[PDB]
Amino acid sequence: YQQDQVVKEDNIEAVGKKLHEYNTQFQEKSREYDRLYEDYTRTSQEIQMKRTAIEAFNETIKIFEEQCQTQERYSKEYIEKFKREGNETEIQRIMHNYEKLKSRISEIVDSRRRLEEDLKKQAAEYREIDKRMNSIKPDLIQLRKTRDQYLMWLTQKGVRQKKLNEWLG
């Protein structure tokens, strides 16, 4: 007066054939998952690298912003002191040099922006990887549970380890 309806087949060879099929399905799904987990781990590391590379872009630009602060504070005296005693060339050199500095900042801002775009894109991949992993987990876990139910059934029935091995291998 008890019950458990789980195994679809009820003769030893048929159950063993379906043990061999379900185990193959499981091993292949495990490899599928493992492949994705490599991609997950790798993409986590690449995203970390890109995120510290952005910090390195900030810190560079911060150094360039300080240079502009200095140039503006420091030049005040020499531009005024070279306006009198008409050395208007030295003024023009200071400012052209300062325009050369500002122009370089824009290149570094551009290259930071390109890396932000890559990180935006790679952050989406990471989520897509994590989603695909999560859709695989049920199949993988179901396939593990089935594999074990079939093994237990054949063990209970008293099938020798030699036959269980060849279905698994």
């Binding site: 240079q67 502009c68 140039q71 040099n97 050369k100 370089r104």
Partner: peptide, 13 residues
């Protein structure tokens, strides 16, 4: 290489 001098001057070579 970008060089930043403490006068505010900038060199590139």
């Amino acid at each position: 290489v970008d060089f930043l001098l403490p006068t505010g001057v900038y060199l590139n070579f």
